[PDB]
């Protein structure tokens, strides 16, 4: 077999939702196999912390710290990935949500299109304001780049 190497540039299936527009609806799957619907967060700010996988015994302080500050600002934090619900309980108003059987990755333009990680969601951050509109987005452009947590927090603070 030949190895499908991983390119430095992140290439997803689409565009992140535009800042200022209504956040696309979603119906993710929760730990109890029920639905985590975007309608459930009406009137609340939401931080979608998106990962290729949260199935790792590692919880970088950078991630924990960010999630804690976000939750402290009054936002509901969803750690979204293609991992099945069963495997999401291993990661670090903060809960995991799985996109294994819904269109979240395509609707939010974050599904990785090629390479060894094709089909998983790219590292990205989407902040939805309490008013329901997208307040901030960042699709991390390269594989080993850390998200701009500071900018996301300023956007979060602005739409609590
Ligand atoms: N797991
Ligand atoms: N490719
Ligand atoms: Y464009
Ligand atoms: Y509904
Ligand atoms: Y570069």
Swiss-Prot record:
Reactions catalysed, as given in the entry: a hydroperoxide + [thioredoxin]-dithiol = an alcohol + [thioredoxin]-disulfide + H2O
The entry's keywords: Antioxidant, Disulfide bond, Oxidoreductase, Peroxidase, Redox-active center
Active-site residues per Swiss-Prot or TrEMBL entry: 59
Keyword Disulfide bond in record: yes
Disulphide bridges: 59-92
Annotated InterPro entries: Redoxin (IPR013740), Thioredoxin-like_sf (IPR036249), Thioredoxin_domain (IPR013766), TPX (IPR002065), Tpx_CS (IPR018219), Tpx_Peroxidase_subfamily (IPR050455)
First-tier enzyme category under EC: oxidoreductase
EC number: 1.11.1.24
Gene3D superfamilies to which the protein is assigned, alphabetical: Glutaredoxin
Thioredoxin domain residues: 17-158
MF annotations from Gene Ontology: thioredoxin peroxidase activity
Domain of life: Bacteria
Assembly and binders: Homodimer.
Protein family membership: Belongs to the peroxiredoxin family. Tpx subfamily.
HAMAP family cross-referenced by the UniProt entry: Tpx
Further remarks about this protein from its record: The active site is a conserved redox-active cysteine residue, the peroxidatic cysteine (C(P)), which makes the nucleophilic attack on the peroxide substrate. The peroxide oxidizes the C(P)-SH to cysteine sulfenic acid (C(P)-SOH), which then reacts with another cysteine residue, the resolving cysteine (C(R)), to form a disulfide bridge. The disulfide is subsequently reduced by an appropriate electron donor to complete the catalytic cycle. In this atypical 2-Cys peroxiredoxin, C(R) is present in the same subunit to form an intramolecular disulfide.
Record PANTHER family: THIOL PEROXIDASE
NCBIfam families associated with the record: PRK00522.1 (NF001808)
Function: Thiol-specific peroxidase that catalyzes the reduction of hydrogen peroxide and organic hydroperoxides to water and alcohols, respectively. Plays a role in cell protection against oxidative stress by detoxifying peroxides.
Name of the featured protein: Thiol peroxidase
Organism field: Mycobacterium tuberculosis (strain CDC 1551 / Oshkosh)
